[PDB]
Amino acid sequence: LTITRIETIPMVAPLMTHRATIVTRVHTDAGIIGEAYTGDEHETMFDIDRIIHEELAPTLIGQDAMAIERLWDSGYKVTFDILRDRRLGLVALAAVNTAIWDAVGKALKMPLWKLWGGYRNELPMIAIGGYYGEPLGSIADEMHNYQELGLAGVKFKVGGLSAAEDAARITAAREAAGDDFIICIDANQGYKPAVAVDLSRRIADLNIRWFEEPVEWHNDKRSMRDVRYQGSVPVCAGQTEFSASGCRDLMETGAIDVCNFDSSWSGGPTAWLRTAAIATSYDVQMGHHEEPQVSTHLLASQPHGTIAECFHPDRDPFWWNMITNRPKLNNGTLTLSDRPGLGWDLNWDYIDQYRV
Amino acid sequence: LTITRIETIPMVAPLAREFRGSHYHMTHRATIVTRVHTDAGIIGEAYTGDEHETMFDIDRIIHEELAPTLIGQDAMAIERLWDSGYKVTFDILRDRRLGLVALAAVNTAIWDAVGKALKMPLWKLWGGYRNELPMIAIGGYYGEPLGSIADEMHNYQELGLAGVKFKVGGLSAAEDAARITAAREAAGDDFIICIDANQGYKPAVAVDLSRRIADLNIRWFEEPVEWHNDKRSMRDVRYQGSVPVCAGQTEFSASGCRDLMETGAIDVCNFDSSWSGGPTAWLRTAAIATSYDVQMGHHEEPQVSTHLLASQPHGTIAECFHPDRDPFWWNMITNRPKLNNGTLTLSDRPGLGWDLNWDYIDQYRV
Amino acid sequence: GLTITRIETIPMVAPLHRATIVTRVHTDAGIIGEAYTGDEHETMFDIDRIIHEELAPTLIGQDAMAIERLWDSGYKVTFDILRDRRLGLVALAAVNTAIWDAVGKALKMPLWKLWGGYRNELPMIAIGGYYGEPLGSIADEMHNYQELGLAGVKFKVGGLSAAEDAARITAAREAAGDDFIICIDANQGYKPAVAVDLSRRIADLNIRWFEEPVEWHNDKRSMRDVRYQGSVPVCAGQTEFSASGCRDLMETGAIDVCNFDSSWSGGPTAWLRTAAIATSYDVQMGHHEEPQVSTHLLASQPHGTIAECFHPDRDPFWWNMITNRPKLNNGTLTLSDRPGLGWDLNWDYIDQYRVS
Amino acid sequence: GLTITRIETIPMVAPLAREFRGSHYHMTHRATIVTRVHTDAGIIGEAYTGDEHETMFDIDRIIHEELAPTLIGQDAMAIERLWDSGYKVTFDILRDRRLGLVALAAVNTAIWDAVGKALKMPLWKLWGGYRNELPMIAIGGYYGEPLGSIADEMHNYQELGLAGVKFKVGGLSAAEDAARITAAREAAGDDFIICIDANQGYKPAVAVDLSRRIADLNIRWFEEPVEWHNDKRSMRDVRYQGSVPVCAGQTEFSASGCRDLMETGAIDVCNFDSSWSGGPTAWLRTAAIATSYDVQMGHHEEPQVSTHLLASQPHGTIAECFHPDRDPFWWNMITNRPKLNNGTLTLSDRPGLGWDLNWDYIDQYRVS
Amino acid sequence: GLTITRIETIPMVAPLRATIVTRVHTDAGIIGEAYTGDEHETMFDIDRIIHEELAPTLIGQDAMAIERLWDSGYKVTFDILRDRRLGLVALAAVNTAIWDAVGKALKMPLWKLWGGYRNELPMIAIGGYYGEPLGSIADEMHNYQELGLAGVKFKVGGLSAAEDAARITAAREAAGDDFIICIDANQGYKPAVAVDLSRRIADLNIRWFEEPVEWHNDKRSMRDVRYQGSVPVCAGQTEFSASGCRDLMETGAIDVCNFDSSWSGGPTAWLRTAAIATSYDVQMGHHEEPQVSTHLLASQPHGTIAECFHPDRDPFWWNMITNRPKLNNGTLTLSDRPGLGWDLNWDYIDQYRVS
Ligand code: NA
Ligand code: NA
Ligand code: NA
Ligand code: NA
Ligand code: NA
Ligand code: NA
């Protein structure tokens, strides 16, 4: 399945004020086009685009798209550049690896959730929320609103206030949503460990699903381990790692119950699936930081996959508009069709309107 | 103390009841009585473990592989004989348990012989920390084959037992939590309750259960999680849960037990001597345990565990099956100490100090 | 049982000013357990005090056969935080060793056999190669050891550069010839890079082991590094306080041989725990000097190595305190079947040098 | 540079009122050594460090025979050079490692006082300058009640302006020491820091049992909960199976030993004692290591040096003293000791450690 | 106190390399100055962080309270949306200049304020670039010996073991024995190839092997190179924090840590790493930045060797500082001038400063 061309369409939409993404398309001599959109970059989008066209495309043009390990291995060298942020190469590699996978699922007439393991084809979906400042309303309104939308739960933002104050915020969300609602919390690396342990004990009776990135970045593995063992809530991390080796270090340290490694930031499905294999050997569950357009397939494929994540429409336009055949949530869950590849129909009006 | 003969008596108990499979099942239980004869008057003897399926391969290893390293040798040079015998574990082609069981069989009979020669009961020869300890029963089988939870618990109490190792691992956390609550409610507060999942849970479910039972004073939570990543996963049950964790019975060597302790997986190590190369191996584990502040248990085999555990400053509690799972403890030893209020007390009889029921043996051998 | 009736000690001092305490445990059966242990000059009377004021009470009227029981209560004297932990440990070793002699005698078993009975003969080497050549040139010293029928030498290094000490070690090997064990001992003298340098220089001299190559504070990890980066097996353990400390050495991968000293560390009961731990790590056992106890200890174990003594002028106890010392033959000592330690103490020498 | 001309030491011994039993140890005297490091610039670095009744003279000899010759004539400003040469006193395998380390700490602390004076800087600032105010608690709750009933002792600490207590345990069962701690909380009430200290007295299961029993009394930390031989791993277990933060380090000889505690996950707080372990130079290495592990720093007693050490560091916690009947030195040695107010003291801007030593007290208790 | 009154930066681009001169003004008359980093592409992003995020935490505060200021400054690294190096470089810039002010106020050279172990250490040059931009291997080596440098840090990581071994071998032949030779793979090899190379050069007295292996598993893989191979291993420059340096040491990855203060929050962070290193018997080095590393390394008992570039490769060390110490027998001796003690060449700064 020979690659003939790599096409990219940088996009910027509004509702900061804008979210950025890149649509990547891999054309083949069969008339099959692999397509995906990846990342939410922002200030670095065109540098990423450059890496895609100048560094990766030559490794790909004329090559067999079906030999994913061969191509991934040569494309990996874009991560070696010591004189720039390693994320740039990783996001660029993720973009092409994801679009290639979509082409390959298409050539094989297999949806990716099946090609990648086929464990199941439905999972729950939660919304990232509880933003400080009540942007999407009060805590209770936000929670009710997600329930209206038919989401299974929320990953609720903490990390900014005292343990006492954030516990009250979480108690409010649990109150509002009632018991039949998944509540995860996410500190975005905000707490000193003692404060995170304090918080974790205060919410021990609110059935919190996991506590994501509880502690400051520098000692995060060992300090989140201590949060996991002194506290009372399962711990989730991985999104901040660059590689499967980094996620392996989390697991080896005993830092985590759930790995939320982000394939869009970290070299794509090929990378993420290595992390998932590693997680099985540690009895660690897989999650995935946002990117529902690829995470739903990745997570469903796996026996140890958990929950997909998205934003409220007003905060992410891309999942809610750019995909014309997104399945309807039913009582919290999303079921994936048997459409080959990622199986998505992109709204090309929206793309034309917002490409830069 | 020269070894002259190695005699083994393969044995198969009557068709007893089997506690597995969702249904009524029956199976014969099997053991091997091993007797090490010596130039003095002394005969060391022990019996080791239910095997039934593999009993004759083990018997063959004993005679074709071990005996040649023993006959003519000095039984009192235990390390020399164990080291020479250890080679039976090397065979990559067969289950390693075959070799380790054969080695334990002989190593234990040899210890019984050495103690007789020195006129020492083994609990004293092995260290002599004390001569009495609690004994609990294994029970709480799914399907209530030994009665309701309550009646089963009351029964063990009336038998003079200190407590129970109660089977879990087969239901949800909530469901198994309720079974353990019923056991504590029935037995009251002065009864040891351990629980045993037989590697049945995924770690989050074990943790859920462990927390649910935090106020029932559960003594320990034995093999809570699946086998493949058991050391790290049970460490997490230990740290995220509320109950001490116990394991070691599934390990093949003291190296394996060392691995569990270094991972931080366990509070109690229940390494089984009879299926891991015998008391010489178990005593090495016990030593390693002291360096980690880990306590020693012993999966069943009361006939040897009573002495092993009692000898050690960090020994905990001896275990025994129901007669149907183990007719050997109950019928084949005619001078078992009588349980007094949870406790078993050991005599000063040299060796393991046991009088075997030769009528029982003559009727079930071959 | 075997009831202990009284504890007698006989503090001693002999010039070379080496110190030792003879301990005698008297029993019902008229059996007396006796041993000498240690060379702690300055602290002897502190140790002596601990035995009579702290240990003896836990012992008089107890069954000496119940070794684990008595060791467990005796161990509490190591809990005193206001004094060198070694004081309690050496006092406990004194009593524990004597008791074991009592038990061996009571059961008519030599300790080498009662402790496992692996073999009854082992090589013995002399600790020497002192700087300043007090015992003569390196060549003279090596030949003298061979005249005494010793299997080899533990040769002092740790005080010069790698190039100078490698040359000294080269001299030892050339004088002695290949059929002679040469261990080397830095007494925690080198920086790790210097020890690695030395180890590589002597890789062809068949050096049996490299004992305590590096400075004390980080010795486990640094000697691990000498072990892996260098070319000679590494030995340590004598500076640990407990079988826990030896386990830490083994778990770090610091050592091929553990030379934990029973007389400094709670006695045979403690050393045998260390021995057991070593089997689980495929580590061999050695024993820093104290041949009057180490011979039985090492000989009883399948993984035992070599016993050690000093030149007669450096330390006189081994050569004068024991009237029935076996004859060295081809470098090896063979132990009799006499029960307990089986030693006839030289009461001329004891009566002459005892003190209050 | 600041050339060292002379090293002078003054050993002291003072009697204590009664005996003070912890768990498996007790005390009748308080000994210390005052070290003075003279310089060609007229500045005298001074400190007193340690309590070492039995071995005081052994330590004094090390100072003079082993250390002084590496210091006389050298530049007191070159701390790392001096410390690197003095460190050899720790190498002798034939003697207690602590002898050398206490000797080294003695001169290192006095040399730091001289350097602070030369630079016109208080050490709490020279060493990092994070803050100049911190809480002080008293080490107390001794068994036998030699300072009075539990309640009386707590109230008295509150009347001295102290922030809380480090309360001795480790000697009884979990249920019994739990009762004693419960009594301290009830007496002091909630606005009072209660640490507990088993001095390595419990088996891990007993420490965990106690930890869990006191989960609701807001206990700040649990110091050396377990027996010494396997302490790092066993206190890790107390830390994760129990309910209160764990603290240790005082029993380690070096920063390498503290690093081992932290790597094992043994501790939330490291209470490494500078005056037993080579002085502020060694301690500040440990503090640096602690930052990389998100471990906080404490300091076993020695308030005359630990106030500056702890206050300098972002992750410094609580300074420690004893009741005056238990230790007269903090309370008599220093004429300008800052006042305890509402649990805290505030250090001045006086250069060095900033202390005026009470020569009238010193002369009454010096020995030879 | 030494109250900070103004944070001034001067971004520069010189032909060509890039840097920022940071100047911390105080209410005394003292101006702390340093230049730090080469960051061409993001220089202005950093400059912005300095003024918009850091300056407000510093104006009117006591420069003498270094732990306090560093603590509140450290938050510029929390930003999850940008490269963590942006904040860490900004933090290093102000922290280095703050230290120079502090040294000046206390009248102490920093090599002495930071410990004073010694005031003299060897300097090597980073070189042996592929494509021979500075001449053949033999001519480059001789050049460095003419300049009076102690040795070279010689680039590898790009070829096969046999081929890079030949190059390294030419360097030792050309230079002779009395010349320090470190090699640097810049994370280039798979472990087996680094091991092969290390064994091949076992006889060439190679001082250390910097960043031998690919990035993703570098800690464990470089430990294996260290133990299977024959040459000491050095790494640290690619770590973001003393925690990451601690991780290298705990894994047994390194003999030498070359943490770069300029990239990692300044001397305060590097000196924490330095303390951690004592506890592991790890030695300290420092990736280039000799204008700060000479003082950092000289102050520590376990400090090793300072690094610069050939003049044609780096104009800053060679031009920015008018009282640069002369190499003498491979070594640089630092003066007693307070702070970093450097006189900056303002003609050069005026020439190449940019906006
Ligand atoms: Na997150
Ligand atoms: Na916990
Ligand atoms: Na079991
Ligand atoms: Na030695
Ligand atoms: Na304490
Ligand atoms: Na480099």
- Show binding-site residues of E: 184, 210
Write down the H helix ranges in chain D. 56-61, 79-86, 97-118, 123-126, 150-159, 174-188, 204-213, 231-241, 255-264, 280-292, 303-312, 328-332, 359-365
Residue among A223, A155, A164 at smallest CA distance from A189: A223
Taking the C-alpha atoms of residue E12 and residue A274, their distance in angstroms, rounded to an integer, is 44
In eight-state DSSP terms, residue A13 is: E
In which residue ranges of chain A is CATH 3.30.390.10 found?
1-110+348-356
Residue of chain D nearest C212, judged by CA positions = D93
Residue C65 sits at the chain B interface (C-beta within 8 Å): yes
Tell me, what amino acid is at D288? A
Strand partners, B295: B268
**SS3 label, residue E341:** coil
Residue B267 sits at the chain D interface (C-beta within 8 Å): yes
Show Cβ contacts of residue E306 under 8 Å, excluding neighbours closer than 6 positions: E121, E122, E123, E124, E286, E290, E293, E294, E297, E332
Contact state of E216 with A244 under an 8 Å Cβ cutoff: yes
Which residues in chain C have Cβ-Cβ distances shorter than 8 Å to D91?
Answer: 188, 215-216
Peptide bond between residue E16 and the one before it cis (omega within 30 degrees of 0): yes
Which CATH number is correct for C110-346, 3.40.720.10, 3.40.50.300, 3.30.70.270, 3.20.20.120? Answer: 3.20.20.120
Residue among E89, E109, E96, E114 at smallest CA distance from E24: E96
Q: How many CB atoms lie within 10 A of CB E350?
A: 10
**In terms of C-beta distances under 8 Å and separation of at least 24 residues, what long-range contacts does B328-332 make, across chains too?**
B328/B13, B328/B29, B328/B31, B328/B47, B328/B303, B329/B302, B329/B303, B331/B357, B331/B360, B332/B47, B332/B356, B332/B357, B332/B360, B332/B361
Residue B240 sits at the chain A interface (C-beta within 8 Å): yes
Its CATH architecture, for the domain D1-121+359-368, is 2-Layer Sandwich (3.30)
Taking the C-alpha atoms of residue A305 and residue A263, their distance in angstroms, rounded to an integer, is 14
B139–chain D nearest CA distance, Å: 26
- What is A248-281 written as a DSSP string? HHHHHHT--SEE---GGGTT-HHHHHHHHHHHHH
Taking the C-alpha atoms of residue A102 and residue C176, their distance in angstroms, rounded to an integer, is 74
Taking the C-alpha atoms of residue C103 and residue B131, their distance in angstroms, rounded to an integer, is 18
Contact state of D226 with B293 under an 8 Å Cβ cutoff: yes
Its CATH architecture, for the domain D122-358, is Alpha-Beta Barrel (3.20)
Length of chain A: 356
Taking the C-alpha atoms of residue C106 and residue C98, their distance in angstroms, rounded to an integer, is 12
Contact state of C193 with E280 under an 8 Å Cβ cutoff: no
In which residue ranges of chain E is CATH 3.20.20.120 found?
109-345
Residue C218 sits at the chain E interface (C-beta within 8 Å): yes
Taking the C-alpha atoms of residue B172 and residue D172, their distance in angstroms, rounded to an integer, is 40
Residue among A299, A116, A203, A280 at smallest CA distance from B202: A280
Contact state of B290 with C119 under an 8 Å Cβ cutoff: no
Contact state of B293 with D227 under an 8 Å Cβ cutoff: yes
Which residues in chain D have Cβ-Cβ distances shorter than 8 Å to B292?
Answer: 230, 233
Q: Which helix (H) or strand (E) holds A96?
A: helix A86-107
Contact state of B291 with D229 under an 8 Å Cβ cutoff: yes
Sign, CA torsion B216/B220/B223/B224: positive
Q: Which whole-number Å values give the CA distances from C205 to A87, C157, C160, C199, E252, in the listed order?
A: 52, 15, 19, 10, 28
Taking the C-alpha atoms of residue B323 and residue A123, their distance in angstroms, rounded to an integer, is 48
Strand partners, B7: B35
In which residue ranges of chain B is CATH 3.30.390.10 found?
1-120+358-366
CATH number for the domain running over E109-345: 3.20.20.120
Two tokens, residue A22: 């890149």
Sign, CA torsion B147/B150/B156/B162: positive
C204 is in an annotated binding site: no
In eight-state DSSP terms, residue E276 is: H
Of the CA atoms within 13 Å of residue D348, those in its CB half-sphere come to 13
In which residue ranges of chain A is CATH 3.20.20.120 found?
111-347
Burial of A107 (0-12, 13-18, 19+ CB in 10 A): middle
* Whether domain B121-357 has CATH 3.20.20.450: no
Q: From the CA of A163, how far away is ligand 2's center (Å)?
A: 18
Contact state of C217 with D256 under an 8 Å Cβ cutoff: yes
Taking the C-alpha atoms of residue E148 and residue E123, their distance in angstroms, rounded to an integer, is 9
Q: From the CA of D273, how far away is ligand 5's center (Å)?
A: 10
3-state secondary structure chain B: CEEEEEEEEEEECCCEEECCCCCCEEECCEEEEEEEEECCCCEEEEEECCCCCCHHHHHHHHHHHHHHHHCCCECCCHHHHHHHHHHHHHCCCCCHHHHHHHHHHHHHHHHHHHHHHHCCEHHHHCCCCCCEEEEEEEECCCCCECECHHHHHHHHHHCCECEEEEECCCCCHHHHHHHHHHHHHHHCCCCEEEEECCCCECHHHHHHHHHHCCCCCCCCEECCECCCCHHHHHHHHHHHCCCCEEECCCCCCHHHHHHHHHHCCCCEECCCHHHCCCHHHHHHHHHHHHHCCCEECCCCCHHHHHHHHHHCCCECCEEECCCCCCHHHHHCECCCCCCECEEEECCCCCECCCCECHHHHHHHEC
* Alpha-carbon torsion, ordered E261, E263, E269, E270, to 10 deg: -30
Question: B357 with B333: CB under 8 angstroms?
Answer: yes
Show Cβ contacts of residue A193 under 8 Å, excluding neighbours closer than 6 positions: A214, A215, A223, A224, A226, A227, D294
C1-109+347-356: CATH homologous superfamily?
Enolase-like, N-terminal domain (3.30.390.10)
Which residues in chain D have Cβ-Cβ distances shorter than 8 Å to E108?
Answer: 77, 119
Q: How many CB atoms lie within 10 A of CB E176?
A: 9
Q: Which whole-number Å values give the CA distances from D323 to B332, D47, D137, D341, in the listed order?
A: 67, 21, 10, 16
End-to-end CA distance of chain A: 30
Q: How many CB atoms lie within 10 A of CB A315?
A: 16
Residue D125 sits at the chain E interface (C-beta within 8 Å): yes
Q: How many CB atoms lie within 10 A of CB E178?
A: 9
Q: How many CB atoms lie within 10 A of CB D31?
A: 20
Q: Which ligand is nearest to the CA of C157?
A: 4
Burial of C87 (0-12, 13-18, 19+ CB in 10 A): buried
Taking the C-alpha atoms of residue B133 and residue B307, their distance in angstroms, rounded to an integer, is 10
In which residue ranges of chain E is CATH 3.30.390.10 found?
1-108+346-355
Taking the C-alpha atoms of residue D225 and residue D219, their distance in angstroms, rounded to an integer, is 13
CATH number for the domain running over B1-120+358-366: 3.30.390.10
Q: Which helix (H) or strand (E) holds C52?
A: none
Chain A partners (3+ C-beta pairs within 8 A) = B, D, E
C242–chain B nearest CA distance, Å: 8
Chain D partners (3+ C-beta pairs within 8 A) = A, B, C, E
Q: To 5 degrees, how large is the angle CA B141–CA B144–CA B146?
A: 85
Residue among A82, A77, A90, A97 at smallest CA distance from A44: A90
C147 is in an annotated binding site: no
Residue among C230, C235, C145 at smallest CA distance from C186: C235
In eight-state DSSP terms, residue E189 is: B
Tell me, what amino acid is at A224? M
- Residue D251 CA from chain centroid, whole number: 11
Strand partners, B333: B356
CATH number for the domain running over E1-108+346-355: 3.30.390.10
Residue among C118, C115, C111 at smallest CA distance from C338: C111
Q: From the CA of C212, how far away is ligand 4's center (Å)?
A: 6
D240–chain B nearest CA distance, Å: 6
Q: How many CB atoms lie within 10 A of CB C203?
A: 12
Contact state of B253 with C280 under an 8 Å Cβ cutoff: yes
Taking the C-alpha atoms of residue E60 and residue E72, their distance in angstroms, rounded to an integer, is 14
Taking the C-alpha atoms of residue B100 and residue B61, their distance in angstroms, rounded to an integer, is 10
Taking the C-alpha atoms of residue D32 and residue D12, their distance in angstroms, rounded to an integer, is 5
Residue C189 sits at the chain E interface (C-beta within 8 Å): no
- Show binding-site residues of B for Mg(2+): 196, 222
Residue C78 sits at the chain D interface (C-beta within 8 Å): yes
* Technique that determined the structure: X-ray
Of the CA atoms within 13 Å of residue E75, those in its CB half-sphere come to 15
In which residue ranges of chain B is CATH 3.20.20.120 found?
121-357
Which residues in chain B have Cβ-Cβ distances shorter than 8 Å to C58?
Answer: none
Taking the C-alpha atoms of residue B87 and residue A331, their distance in angstroms, rounded to an integer, is 61
Tell the CATH topology of A1-110+348-356: Enolase-like; domain 1 (3.30.390)
Chain B partners (3+ C-beta pairs within 8 A) = A, C, D
Taking the C-alpha atoms of residue B210 and residue E162, their distance in angstroms, rounded to an integer, is 58
Residue A244 sits at the chain E interface (C-beta within 8 Å): yes
Phi, psi of A232 (to 5 degrees): -135, 10
Q: From the CA of E339, how far away is ligand 1's center (Å)?
A: 43
- What is A163-217 written as a DSSP string? HHHHHHHHHHHHHHH-SSSEEEEE-TT-B-HHHHHHHHHHTTTS----EES-B-S
Its CATH architecture, for the domain A111-347, is Alpha-Beta Barrel (3.20)
Instruction: Pick E216's closest partner by Cβ from A216, A219, A245.
Output: A245
Q: From the CA of C288, how far away is ligand 4's center (Å)?
A: 6
Question: C102 with C25: CB under 8 angstroms?
Answer: yes
Taking the C-alpha atoms of residue A171 and residue A203, their distance in angstroms, rounded to an integer, is 8
Q: Which helix (H) or strand (E) holds C85?
A: helix C85-106
Contact state of D230 with B264 under an 8 Å Cβ cutoff: no
Taking the C-alpha atoms of residue B206 and residue B193, their distance in angstroms, rounded to an integer, is 16
Q: Which whole-number Å values give the CA distances from A244 to A112, A266, E235, in the listed order?
A: 20, 9, 21
Burial of C56 (0-12, 13-18, 19+ CB in 10 A): middle
Question: B295 with B247: CB under 8 angstroms?
Answer: no
